[PDB]
Write a protein that binds this ligand. Structure first.
Ligand SMILES: *[C@@H]1O[C@H](CO)[C@@H](O[C@@H]2O[C@H](CO)[C@@H](O[C@@H]3O[C@H](CO)[C@@H](O)[C@H](O[C@H]4O[C@H](CO)[C@@H](O)[C@H](O)[C@@H]4O[C@H]4O[C@H](CO)[C@@H](O)[C@H](O)[C@@H]4O)[C@@H]3O)[C@H](O)[C@H]2NC(C)=O)[C@H](O)[C@H]1NC(C)=O
Ligand SMILES: *[C@@H]1O[C@H](CO)[C@@H](O[C@@H]2O[C@H](CO)[C@@H](O)[C@H](O)[C@H]2NC(C)=O)[C@H](O)[C@H]1NC(C)=O
Ligand SMILES: *[C@@H]1O[C@H](CO)[C@@H](O[C@@H]2O[C@H](CO)[C@@H](O)[C@H](O)[C@H]2NC(C)=O)[C@H](O)[C@H]1NC(C)=O
Ligand SMILES: *[C@@H]1O[C@H](CO)[C@@H](O[C@@H]2O[C@H](CO)[C@@H](O)[C@H](O)[C@H]2NC(C)=O)[C@H](O)[C@H]1NC(C)=O
Ligand SMILES: *[C@@H]1O[C@H](CO)[C@@H](O[C@@H]2O[C@H](CO)[C@@H](O)[C@H](O)[C@H]2NC(C)=O)[C@H](O)[C@H]1NC(C)=O
Ligand SMILES: *[C@@H]1O[C@H](CO)[C@@H](O[C@@H]2O[C@H](CO)[C@@H](O)[C@H](O)[C@H]2NC(C)=O)[C@H](O)[C@H]1NC(C)=O
Ligand SMILES: *[C@@H]1O[C@H](CO)[C@@H](O[C@@H]2O[C@H](CO)[C@@H](O)[C@H](O)[C@H]2NC(C)=O)[C@H](O)[C@H]1NC(C)=O
Ligand SMILES: *[C@@H]1O[C@H](CO)[C@@H](O[C@@H]2O[C@H](CO)[C@@H](O)[C@H](O)[C@H]2NC(C)=O)[C@H](O)[C@H]1NC(C)=O
Ligand SMILES: *[C@@H]1O[C@H](CO)[C@@H](O[C@@H]2O[C@H](CO)[C@@H](O)[C@H](O)[C@H]2NC(C)=O)[C@H](O)[C@H]1NC(C)=O
Ligand SMILES: *[C@@H]1O[C@H](CO)[C@@H](O[C@@H]2O[C@H](CO)[C@@H](O)[C@H](O)[C@H]2NC(C)=O)[C@H](O)[C@H]1NC(C)=O
Ligand SMILES: *[C@@H]1O[C@H](CO)[C@@H](O)[C@H](O)[C@H]1NC(C)=O
Ligand SMILES: *[C@@H]1O[C@H](CO)[C@@H](O)[C@H](O)[C@H]1NC(C)=O
Ligand SMILES: *[C@@H]1O[C@H](CO)[C@@H](O)[C@H](O)[C@H]1NC(C)=O
Ligand SMILES: *[C@@H]1O[C@H](CO)[C@@H](O)[C@H](O)[C@H]1NC(C)=O
Ligand SMILES: *[C@@H]1O[C@H](CO)[C@@H](O)[C@H](O)[C@H]1NC(C)=O
Ligand SMILES: *[C@@H]1O[C@H](CO)[C@@H](O)[C@H](O)[C@H]1NC(C)=O
Ligand SMILES: *[C@@H]1O[C@H](CO)[C@@H](O)[C@H](O)[C@H]1NC(C)=O
Ligand SMILES: *[C@@H]1O[C@H](CO)[C@@H](O)[C@H](O)[C@H]1NC(C)=O
Ligand SMILES: *[C@@H]1O[C@H](CO)[C@@H](O)[C@H](O)[C@H]1NC(C)=O
Ligand SMILES: *[C@@H]1O[C@H](CO)[C@@H](O)[C@H](O)[C@H]1NC(C)=O
Ligand SMILES: *[C@@H]1O[C@H](CO)[C@@H](O)[C@H](O)[C@H]1NC(C)=O
Ligand SMILES: *[C@@H]1O[C@H](CO)[C@@H](O)[C@H](O)[C@H]1NC(C)=O
Ligand SMILES: *[C@@H]1O[C@H](CO)[C@@H](O)[C@H](O)[C@H]1NC(C)=O
Ligand SMILES: *[C@@H]1O[C@H](CO)[C@@H](O)[C@H](O)[C@H]1NC(C)=O
Ligand SMILES: *[C@@H]1O[C@H](CO)[C@@H](O)[C@H](O)[C@H]1NC(C)=O
Ligand SMILES: *[C@@H]1O[C@H](CO)[C@@H](O)[C@H](O)[C@H]1NC(C)=O
Ligand SMILES: *[C@@H]1O[C@H](CO)[C@@H](O)[C@H](O)[C@H]1NC(C)=O
Ligand SMILES: *[C@@H]1O[C@H](CO)[C@@H](O)[C@H](O)[C@H]1NC(C)=O
Lengths: 123, 436, 122, 122, 122, 48, 48
């Protein structure tokens, strides 16, 4: 059973920072690209960031490009997101998801297969 | 929507026949320095999920080893004294007429009108020869046996014939695949295959009938042949236990030296300091019987499950193909193995008499001969029989010792190795395209 | 792993050991040993020349503009990379090697000419 | 065409056969045959080294920053490419080859240094 | 200057003579002379192979993504380039050469894989 | 043509007693001498 | 007709024909050849 479980979150003052993390299992962590998707309270879905399976390539939506870091630890089967210089506009549920880009040897997807339940971040 | 990509450094190979270099360790006939002093460090990479077939009967490493050994041997003899003057009518009598043993008539006391270092002078020389070195012309007049085909070269009597092991090593771009399996019969897949740079050291031991000082089988006697159903092919039997053989020439001999030219001298058997005895080899009888029992049991696995296996003595030819032969201490022995192959297998020492020769014709090279100098003192040899070469002729099959073709003595060590060429370039589809 | 350690590994996994294999391509009686070394050098240079000709002169891995033809042993994508070794792949497409190489050479000369024209646009 | 098939063709037309020629550069008595192979390899490497030095390491065709001097047999542009063969061109400028090569080496070292400086600007 | 003329010059000054040195790497009794030429070729190719492996295939000077470790004889920056010769530098870091080379190979394979992934993003 | 490049600020040690150029010259001369005599008449008959 | 220097009588002339001339040569004598050993592995052949 594939599961993505988010932690962290909470209310932070604007101008502050926090870090989210997601643990995952039921699949080889190192075989899949992952991303964070934002669910603002009334917007539903916004893409935020994408990281490849080796943790070497990261992509961001312009709105967080100078503020957020997406990272991985494949020995821990952990995905994480560091958010700096927070704005009220970043209030959302942040979902851990698997999918998006791939290895180029393995049928690139460009869609998300699995979702966690998401951490709630309020700013 | 897939694109061709190119990968260089791809771990693939194809079978290939190339030149291997010789690597070494350690005067001596094999100390040529053509064979490069190396680090024996047996670095080995196991190929965990690779299975590849081998065929020991088509192994060019064997052909290379055969040629390298003959070439080496010939180069070592090249600068040594040519005993042209010895192919002269020789006058002989028996050394010890008053002898009633197996050696009576075997050693002859011969005289020559020999060349001295000055062109106008001759000297009278008395020397001892073995019966096998001379024939009558018809005291009686004799000639040396080489006089039919060749001059004899004095065997560089400073140089040892000890079989120092050598290693074969792949050149860059090539690799040696080692079978590493068990119960490998010489052909077909080896799921245990690993990659090495160099082979184990192999001692260039030269023999007939029995294989000496080689590798033993890991578990059980292994019987290998090119075509087991073809009686025109021989059988290599690898033992899983050594049989110790003790050989000797229990005669204290003294060696003399005569100048026969401006810088040349030859060595010869001077006299016997005691009493004449026949050379011989000792094999534990019970051990030999157990050894054959194992061989028979294994032959029955694919041939004659419920039939009769008979061992017999060789069929005939000259000594080089009918008797056991080996070099030991530098001396050349020919031993009668009939005592080892005298039994029928149906669903406490042993002694082999031995003869020696001074005039040697190795590898069936007709037109060449070597004179082995006699060796002062007494020779004691200890060795491991590690295998047999057998040939086979209702309910009974007869097996006889084989030999003569020296390549069979190298297949027994090189069957584990294959040489391949690395071909590190290939293509495969991926989803990546050039930006162009 | 070490040299050829990846030979039994899948094609995908083995792509990480290209460096290892590449370094082991370089790293009268005596005359035949010398001959063998010379031939090994010529072989090496021929492989390098092809990589140069195809526009892949300094890479262990590179991409080209030649599409994969389905006639060239179409074996899916993930099946090739995850459930096959390079030794097997080299047999699956052994009759297409010359076709592919010819295409790779042609779809380079076309690229060099296009680049040359662009460099002449003021 | 085939090897040297373009030798009598114009310089322009012959630019399309560079691949063909490149592949045919690689593709006691016996010792002199071995010597010849070794020398052929050294020659090959010298040409490759120059291409490397000039900043044209993996191309059959490349451009440089050295301007053509009119003193180097100014024969127009279209006359050279359309009404002359490479064999003739090689004689038209045979006395300028070393000058051109020296310039090509210098206007590379200048480029490598400029690139190196730019990579140090944070 | 000429060949090795810069050997006593500072490392910085000597960086301008790389071209000179590079060209002088290429430019029975007889069999040993032939052997020496063959070995010189193999040596040359090994150096070129490393430059290829490290992602520096056609340059006399290139940059990498491997940071300099202070443990590798930290001798400042200006002291190395202005008050030291290459002959001295080669001793100052002789025990780190294999470490550095290993790092240079690893931080290439990582780059080739990242480039390969990017070329697969539609 | 004795082309020579002076190394203005280089100092390096020499050791003439461990110089393999000497060993090579020794072997080249002996080998040469021996090859030149190789095809000439052997005066075997004079050792009489 | 080819020569290095056709006006120089010190040079020869190579003439290449455009038609063969057939030549039939023979040694019409039925000979028998004998063989004698002259050393340890040597023999020479001669007209018997
Ligand atoms: C199978 O393997 C076994 C095990 O290795 C082999 O048996 C060994 O064989 C070697 C060589 O025959 C033998 O070594 C000799 O032992 C003698 C014991 O006293 C030594 O005296 C003898 O030394 C002489 O020869 C050397 C050759 O280089 C000289 O360097 C040394 O100075 C000695 O030479 C003097 O004496 C001779 C005698 O006439 C004289 O001519 C010389 O001028 C000089 O004066 C060797 O050391 C091993 O002992 C054997 N091992 C055993 C256990 O017996 C066996 O042979 C292999 N099988 C085959 C077929 O080869
Ligand atoms: C061994 O070699 C023999 C060659 O003699 C192969 O089989 C022979 O095939 C011919 C065909 O007419 C028959 O007449 C022979 O009687 C066959 N001989 C035998 C021994 O069967 C034989 O198949 C080869 N064996 C193997 C194991 O390859
Ligand atoms: C071979 O025969 C010769 C000839 O008889 C032996 O030499 C003789 O030995 C006796 C021993 O006392 C001498 O008195 C004779 O003068 C010797 N004869 C000559 C011609 O010298 C010779 O010893 C025999 N060879 C051996 C090894 O015994
Ligand atoms: C070969 O010779 C060796 C001696 O070199 C023999 O070994 C001895 O065998 C007896 C038998 O009881 C043992 O007690 C000795 O201790 C053994 N000696 C050594 C050194 O091990 C060997 O048995 C002989 N082999 C044959 C076939 O006779
Ligand atoms: C090995 O010894 C045996 C036993 O002496 C030899 O066989 C004998 O040869 C004689 C020769 O006429 C025969 O009359 C005997 O009948 C043979 N005996 C047997 C049991 O067959 C044998 O030839 C010797 N081997 C060699 C190679 O010489
Ligand atoms: C894939 O390979 C096939 C087989 O060669 C190509 O099909 C051939 O294309 C030529 C082009 O004129 C036709 O004349 C042949 O009759 C075709 N063969 C068959 C069996 O139809 C095909 O075009 C190739 N596809 C790609 C994308 O290169
Ligand atoms: C083209 O080649 C000519 C001939 O070498 C160059 O002209 C020389 O330039 C040097 C520069 O100092 C002068 O000293 C020479 O006197 C010039 N020669 C003549 C005949 O005037 C010319 O500069 C080169 N042009 C280019 C663009 O490189
Ligand atoms: C610089 O080199 C030093 C010495 O090797 C590195 O320090 C070692 O790093 C490993 C990493 O796990 C530790 O286990 C060792 O104990 C460290 N050694 C010491 C003496 O502390 C250092 O990391 C290197 N730095 C860089 C930037 O590569
Ligand atoms: C053939 O060689 C002769 C060499 O003798 C060349 O012409 C000679 O030139 C000298 C110059 O003084 C005259 O004295 C000779 O009389 C000339 N000889 C002839 C045969 O004319 C001659 O020109 C060469 N011919 C060709 C065709 O090259
Ligand atoms: C060369 O001359 C000799 C000497 O006369 C010939 O040999 C003789 O041939 C006759 C023929 O009947 C014999 O009877 C003689 O006995 C032979 N003489 C000798 C010494 O053997 C010889 O045949 C001539 N050669 C040829 C080829 O005819
Ligand atoms: C040596 O030559 C003489 C010459 O008459 C001969 O009688 C003698 O028997 C010869 N001796 C030997 C040993 O051949
Ligand atoms: C020459 O060969 C024949 C063949 O049987 C043999 O009888 C004769 O004795 C041989 N001669 C020598 C010198 O061995
Ligand atoms: C060796 O094993 C293979 C396995 O099939 C068999 O075909 C071959 O005949 C065997 N060789 C012998 C000599 O029995
Ligand atoms: C050898 O084995 C056979 C098997 O029947 C046996 O009869 C014979 O006595 C054995 N010989 C020895 C020496 O044990
Ligand atoms: C071969 O001999 C063994 C001995 O135990 C026996 O078990 C096996 O069944 C025999 N094979 C055949 C085909 O009879
Ligand atoms: C085999 O043993 C018997 C037992 O008496 C013996 O007579 C016979 O000669 C032997 N055969 C051989 C070849 O030794
Ligand atoms: C041979 O006889 C000599 C005579 O002194 C003796 O010294 C030597 O030890 C003897 N050698 C052997 C092996 O008996
Ligand atoms: C014979 O095999 C035994 C097994 O260990 C080994 O110790 C001995 O040295 C071997 N003898 C030879 C000559 O290899
Ligand atoms: C060999 O096959 C087994 C089967 O599960 C696999 O786990 C193992 O990783 C494979 N080894 C290699 C080198 O691919
Ligand atoms: C072949 O490719 C299709 C594309 O989606 C895939 O679903 C199928 O499983 C692949 N077959 C194999 C054997 O992988
Ligand atoms: C190549 O052609 C031969 C011709 O029979 C065929 O057997 C083989 O399978 C072909 N290989 C491929 C990769 O199709
Ligand atoms: C040779 O010259 C003729 C003249 O018209 C031209 O048409 C032809 O194409 C030329 N051939 C080549 C190979 O350029
Ligand atoms: C030389 O170049 C000029 C530039 O326009 C051109 O008009 C003229 O025709 C060219 N001459 C030749 C021979 O092509
Ligand atoms: C090169 O110089 C020689 C010197 O006479 C001259 O004849 C030749 O035409 C020159 N070549 C060029 C391309 O100018
Ligand atoms: C040698 O040292 C002196 C010291 O001032 C310096 O001026 C000179 O340029 C140096 N030479 C080289 C080649 O660096
Ligand atoms: C070492 O680097 C520091 C950095 O500013 C510099 O100030 C100092 O002078 C350097 N030391 C030497 C010997 O150049
Ligand atoms: C390399 O290690 C040896 C070991 O004693 C040391 O003496 C030497 O100075 C070291 N070199 C460097 C560059 O640290
Ligand atoms: C061959 O033809 C050329 C053409 O000019 C001529 O000069 C030369 O003299 C001729 N050679 C002979 C031997 O006539």
């Amino acid at each position: 059973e594939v599961q993505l479980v988010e932690t962290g979150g909470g209310l932070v003052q604007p101008g502050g920072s926090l870090k989210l993390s997601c643990r995952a299992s039921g699949y080889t962590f190192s075989s899949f690209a992952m991303s964070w998707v934002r669910q603002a309270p009334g917007k539903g879905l916004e893409w935020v960031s994408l990281i490849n399976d080796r943790g070497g390539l990261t992509f961001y939506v312009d709105s967080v490009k100078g503020r957020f870091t997406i990272s991985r630890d494949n020995s821990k089967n952990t995905l994480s997101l560091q958010m700096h210089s927070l704005r009220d506009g970043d209030t959302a549920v942040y979902y851990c998801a698997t999918g998006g880009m791939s290895s180029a040897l393995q049928s690139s997807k460009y869609y998300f297969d699995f979702w966690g339940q998401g951490a709630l971040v309020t700013v | 929507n897939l694109w061709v990509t190119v990968y260089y450094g791809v771990p693939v190979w194809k079978d290939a026949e190339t030149t291997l270099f010789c690597a070494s360790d350690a005067h001596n006939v094999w100390a040529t320095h053509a064979c490069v002093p190396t680090d024996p460090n047996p670095q080995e990479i196991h190929l965990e999920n690779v299975t590849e077939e081998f065929n020991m009967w088509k192994n060019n490493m064997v052909e290379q080893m055969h040629e390298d050994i003959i070439s080496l041997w010939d180069q070592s003899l090249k600068p040594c004294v040519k005993l042209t003057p010895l192919c002269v009518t020789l006058q002989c009598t028996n050394y010890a007429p008053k002898l009633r043993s197996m050696m009576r008539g075997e050693i002859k006391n011969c005289s020559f009108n020999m060349t001295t270092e000055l062109r106008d002078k001759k000297q009278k020389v008395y020397s001892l020869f073995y019966r096998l070195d001379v024939v009558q012309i018809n005291n009686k007049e004799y000639r040396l046996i080489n006089c039919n085909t060749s001059a004899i070269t004095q065997a560089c009597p400073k140089v040892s014939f000890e079989p120092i092991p050598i290693h074969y090593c792949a050149p860059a771009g090539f690799a040696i695949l080692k079978c590493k399996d068990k119960k490998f019969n010489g052909t077909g897949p080896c799921p245990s295959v690993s990659t090495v740079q160099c082979t184990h050291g192999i001692k260039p031991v030269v023999s007939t009938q029995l294989l000496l000082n080689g590798s033993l089988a890991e578990e059980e006697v292994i019987i290998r042949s090119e075509n087991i159903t073809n009686n025109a092919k021989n059988i290599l039997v690898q033992l899983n236990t050594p049989v110790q053989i003790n050989c000797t020439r229990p005669s204290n001999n003294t060696v003399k030296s005569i100048r026969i030219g401006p810088g040349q001298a030859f060595y010869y058997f001077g006299d016997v300091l005691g009493h004449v005895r026949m050379a011989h080899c000792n094999i534990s009888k019970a051990t030999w019987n157990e050894t054959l029992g194992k061989v028979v049991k294994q032959l029955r696995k694919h041939f004659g499950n419920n039939t009769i296996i008979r061992f017999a003595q060789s069929s005939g030819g000259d000594l080089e193909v009918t008797t056991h032969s080996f070099n030991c201490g530098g001396e050349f022995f020919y031993c009668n193995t009939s005592g080892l192959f005298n039994s029928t297998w149906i669903s406490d020492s042993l002694i082999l008499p031995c003869w020696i020769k001074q005039i040697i014709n190795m590898w069936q090279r007709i037109g060449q001969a070597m004179y082995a100098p006699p060796i002062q003192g007494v020779i004691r040899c200890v060795s491991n029989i590690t295998g047999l070469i057998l040939t086979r002729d209702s309910t009974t099959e007869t097996f006889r010792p084989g030999g003569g073709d020296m390549r069979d003595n190298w297949r027994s060590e090189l069957y584990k190795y294959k040489v391949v060429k690395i071909e590190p370039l290939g293509v495969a589809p991926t989803r990546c395209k050039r930006r162009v | 792993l070490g040299f050829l350690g990846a030979a039994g590994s899948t094609m995908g996994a083995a792509s990480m050991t290209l460096t290892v294999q590449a370094r082991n391509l370089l790293s009268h009686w005596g005359i035949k040993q010398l001959q063998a070394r010379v031939l090994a050098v010529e072989h090496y240079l021929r492989d390098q020349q092809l990589l140069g000709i195809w526009g892949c002169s300094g890479k262990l891995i590179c991409c080209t503009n030649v599409p994969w033809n389905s006639s060239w042993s179409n074996r899916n994508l993930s099946e090739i990379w995850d459930n096959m070794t390079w030794l097997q792949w080299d047999k699956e497409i052994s009759n297409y090697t010359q076709i592919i190489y010819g295409l790779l050479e042609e779809s380079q000369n076309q690229q060099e000419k296009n680049e040359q024209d662009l460099l002449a646009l003021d």
